[PDB]
Structure 1
Amino acid sequence: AFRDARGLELGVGRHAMAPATIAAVRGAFEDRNYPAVFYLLQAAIHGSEHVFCALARLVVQCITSYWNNTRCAAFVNDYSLVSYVVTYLGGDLPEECMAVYRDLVAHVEALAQLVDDFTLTGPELGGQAQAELNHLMRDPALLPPLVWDCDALMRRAALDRHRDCRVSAGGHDPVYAAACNVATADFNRNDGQLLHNTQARAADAADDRPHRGADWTVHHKIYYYVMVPAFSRGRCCTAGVRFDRVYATLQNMVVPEITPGEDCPSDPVTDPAHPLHPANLVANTVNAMFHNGRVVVDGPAMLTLQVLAHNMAERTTALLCSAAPDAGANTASTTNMRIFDGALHAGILLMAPQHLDHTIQNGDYFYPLPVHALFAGADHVANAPNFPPALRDLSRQVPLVPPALGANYFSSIRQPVVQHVRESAAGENALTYALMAGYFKI
């Protein structure tokens, strides 16, 4: 209650989230019968502009089909996907469904202006500006838990030597790659090759310059570590994605040829030439996959999926990273001790536990991984095979984060931030200010 009053101390009215728009987000993390088609796209786009603006007729027909169902937002998983619907998708979504998405991008930017109020202006310290040395979420010593790029790494690699910068990548040092192809992919490589696939267009293909500038990583950090634990109330962890079968699903296509004197099939029920018609529903097709989740998609919109050939990717890699305390706090007493932060690369955060759907086996798509003590599934860590039976007693009480991604005395956010979420009584509009006033450094 002391921290929640601190959240009200910044709740003077800098920005408020609308209360009718909160319930669309809480339902989204509460969703059962939440179709895994959206999860497959969240692995498919990767956050690439080239893939997103190609699949725009699908996603608009995906969201409108979902907003007409649940009165709950879609694509709440990846923050990169959230802002792209706000920016590069216009008003072709309905009038109310956009206003939910307007608030979230505003609310993330609203948290960013807390810092510039509480930092005094002045010169840099070696080797970064001192408006960054108060709020931990602006420092590049952190990483977002799910990073699709190497942008946060390259902002980090410019930092000076006598504060350590070592970032391990699967037991290797990171090596970059511009783009992949169908004949290039080679999923099961173990080396330090990482990927940079999300670009504006294919004409750029850059490696050593980061795409869009350093505030873009800050918006991702503010979303996953402030917004996400406030709405989800624990209950959500991340997952590595088997790219073997995700691409192998989505390229299954059944679209019948159309008589030239006939119009476009629109009605999903009565049209036999419709792709989601029950005559075209064959098992293990994607037409079967949409109908599993009550999604209405037009006929020729289905053929836009061919862009997933070009911009591909590979394995979810675990990334330990090592920094020893940021400048102004480096003293001869404190050099040797380190701060380790876990972060998956190209991973998916599971927004709800799902067990009772035996239409998908546990492990066909997603390999669940608890990055941080914030992100630990109380249910879908315990029921992912193979799990030892003596632990599902103890799995609910404590998180099960492996120290291959950092432990709870070394990680920069310790345990009792997580317990403050579960004991919150002030509502969502006060917690988002309350966490931000916690994340300031001592």
Structure 2
Amino acid sequence: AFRDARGLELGVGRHAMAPATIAAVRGAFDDRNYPAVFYLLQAAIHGSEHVFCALARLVVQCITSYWNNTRCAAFVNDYSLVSYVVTYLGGDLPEECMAVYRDLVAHVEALAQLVDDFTLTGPELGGQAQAELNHLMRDPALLPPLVWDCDALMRRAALDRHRDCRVSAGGHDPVYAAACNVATADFNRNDGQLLHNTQARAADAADDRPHRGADWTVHHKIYYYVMVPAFSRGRCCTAGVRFDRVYATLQNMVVPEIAPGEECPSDPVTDPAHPLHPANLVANTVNAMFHNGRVVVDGPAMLTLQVLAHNMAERTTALLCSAAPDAGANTASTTNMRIFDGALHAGILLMAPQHLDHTIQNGDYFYPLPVHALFAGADHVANAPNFPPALRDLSRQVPLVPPALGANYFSSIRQPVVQHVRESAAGENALTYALMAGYFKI
């Protein structure tokens, strides 16, 4: 009852997300038939510029089909996939469709200026910016929980040695590769090796530098730690993604041949030359997968999937890291402690619990991983296979984060931020400021 009144202090006319763009987001966290194709595409487009600029004809006709079946926003859990539509897909989505996507972006840059009103003009202190040493979302000491890159990882290692900045990515130090292809698959290698696939084009391929701006990681840390827990009320979690079958079940392609005097089909009911017609719905195929979610896809847009042959991806790795405290807080009575933040390189956050489907088995694609205590599904963790039955009443009260991804007391955000989300009633506009009113350092 106290943080919510403090949250109203920033709601004095900075930005207000419109109520027509609230319920289009809440539904996407509530669809038990959210189509699982979009989960495959988040494992397929996987944060890249080049992959997204070829698959535009799919993603528009996936959203506009989903716009006419549920009236909810798509691709919500990935800020990278939100921000690419708002930069690129301008005049193919309808007028009404674009109104939701800006209020998920122009709200975020209003959240970033919460820092820029409560920080004085100071010089650098420990080789770090003055705006970092007040609010948590500016610090590179954290990591975004879903990183398709090493952009937050490049900038973290550039800090001074007085803050111990090491990352133990599965017992090995992270080695940064360049690209992944057909002949460099190796889907179960156990080196400390992460990708840097997401680039503007092929020639701009470097590993000595990060590829994007420095504010970019701050936009994600705001989105995944403020926006996402404000909607889902603590009913969502991250997951590790089996890339072994996603590149298989997207390349089970059945594309019909078009006669050289006929025309392109556009009807998923009448014509047989369409890839969603029952005379082309072979079982366990890609055409079967779009019909599962009722996603109307044009004919030659299916042929554009060949970009996945060039930009592969390895796996999902755990990411532990050590961090000494702040440059303006390093007392000699504090040198003996660390702060451990969890992350997943190349992971996908799950929104709604689809354990009641029987058309796809549990341990096929997405093994769930409760990285942070904010992200621990009550039905997500307790429905993975080989779950011991003596915990189903234990799983309900407490979150189930393993100390392979950082426990309570050695993390940055403790338990009670989780419980403030569930026990509030402020609405979807005041929580996104009231959470920001809690991420200020001491």
**Shorter-chain TM-score range:** over 0.9
Q: Do the aligned partners of 1:27 and 1:72 also contact (CA within 8 Å) in 2? A: yes
Deviations 1:377-407 (A, max 9, x none): 1001001101000001100100000000001
Instruction: State the alpha-carbon separation in 2 of the partners of residues 269 and 214 from structure 1.
Output: 49
Query: C-alpha distance in 2, partners of 1:324/1:157?
Result: 13
Deviations 1:68-93 (A, max 9, x none): 11110000021100010000111210
How far the C-alpha of 1:259 sits from its partner, in A, is: 1.2
Secondary structure of 2:59's partner? Answer: helix
Output one character per residue of 1:267-307: Cα deviation in whole Å (capped at 9) or x when no partner: 11101010111000011101000000000000000000000
Hey, what's the Cα distance between the residues in 2 that align with 1:58 and 1:263?
19
Does 1:151 find its partner at 2:151?
A: yes
Q: Cα deviation per residue 1:37-82 (whole Å; 9 max; x = unaligned)?
A: 0000000111100000010000000000001111100000211000
Once residues 302 and 364 of structure 1 are traced to their aligned partners in structure 2, the CA distance between those partners, rounded to angstroms, is 24
Question: Which residue pairs with 1:74 in the alignment?
Answer: 74
Q: Tell me if the contact between 1:268 and 1:277 (Cα under 8 Å) persists in the aligned partners.
A: yes
Contact 1:91 1:98 in 2 (8 A): no
Q: Distance in 2 between matches of 1:76 and 1:47?
A: 13
Cα distance in structure 2, aligned partners of 1:259 and 1:228: 47
- CA-to-aligned-CA distance 1:221-241 (integer Å, 9 cap, x gap): 000000000000000000000
1:131 CA displacement: 1.5
- The separation in 1 between residues aligned to 2:366 and 2:168, in whole angstroms, is 23
Aligned runs of 1:31-180 on 2, under 5 Å? 31-180=31-180
Q: Compute the displacement of 1:315 (Å).
A: 1.3
Fraction of identical pairs, as percent: 99
Deviations 1:91-148 (A, max 9, x none): 2101111100010100110000010100000211121121210011110000000000
Q: Structure 1: which 5+ residue stretches go unaligned? A: none
Question: CA separation in 1, counterparts of 2:116 and 2:398?
Answer: 36
| 1:315-362 deviation digits (Å, cap 9, x = unpaired) | 100000110101110010100111000001100000111111110000
Q: Is the 8 A contact 2:243 2:315 kept in 1?
A: yes
Instruction: Work out the CA distance in 2 between the residues paired with 1:274 and 1:405.
Output: 46
Local SS of the residue matching 2:382: coil
| Aligned mates of 1:338, 1:286 — CA distance in 2 | 47
Residue 305 in 1 paired to residue 305 in 2? yes
Q: Please give the alpha-carbon distance, in whole angstroms, between the structure 2 residues aligned to 1:188 and 1:410.
A: 30
Please state whether the residue corresponding to 1:204 is helix, strand or coil.
Answer: coil
Q: Is the 8 A contact 2:269 2:277 kept in 1?
A: yes
Q: Measure how far apart 1:208 and its partner are.
A: 1.6
Runs (5+) with no aligned partner, structure 2: none
Rounded to whole Å, the distance in 2 between the matches of 1:259 and 1:44 is 30
Q: TM-score, normalised by structure 2?
A: 0.99
Note the C-alpha offset of 1:182: 0.7
1:373 CA drift (Å):
0.2
Q: Secondary structure at the match of 1:58?
A: helix
Would the aligned equivalents of 1:17 and 1:429 in 2 still touch at CA under 8 Å? Answer: yes
| In structure 2, C-alpha distance between the alignment counterparts of 1:258 and 1:20, rounded to whole Å | 42
SS in 1 for 2:420: helix
- Counterpart-to-counterpart distance in 2, 1:360 and 1:60: 26
Q: Is residue 28–residue 74 contact of structure 1 (8 Å, CA) maintained in 2?
A: yes
Q: CA deviation at 1:166?
A: 1.1
Aligned residues between the structures: 442
Q: Which residue number in structure 2 is paired with residue 264 of structure 1?
A: 264
What is the Cα deviation at residue 441 of structure 1? 0.1
Whether the 8 Å CA contact 2:57–2:301 is kept in 1: the answer is: yes
Deviation at 1:439, TM superposition (A): 0.1
Contact between 1:137 and 1:221, CA under 8 Å: does it hold in 2? yes
* Matched-pair contact (CA < 8 Å) for 1:245–1:365: yes
Kept after mapping to 2: 8 A contact 1:181/1:310: yes
TM-score, normalization by structure 1: 0.99
Task: Say whether the 8 Å CA contact 2:77–2:228 is kept in structure 1.
Answer: no
- Quote the offset at 1:258 in angstroms: 1.2
What SS is found at the alignment partner of 1:82?
helix
Post-superposition CA distance 1:166-205 (Å, at most 9, x none): 1111111000111000110111001101111100111111
Q: Return the offset for 1:413.
A: 0.2
Distance 1:168 1:357 in 2: 36
2:321/2:342 contact within 8 Å kept: yes
Question: Is 2:316 the counterpart of 1:316?
Answer: yes
SS of match in other structure, 1:70? coil
In 2, distance between residues paired with 1:400 and 1:356? Answer: 21
Tell me, yes or no, if the aligned pair for 1:145 and 1:343 is still in contact at 8 Å.
yes
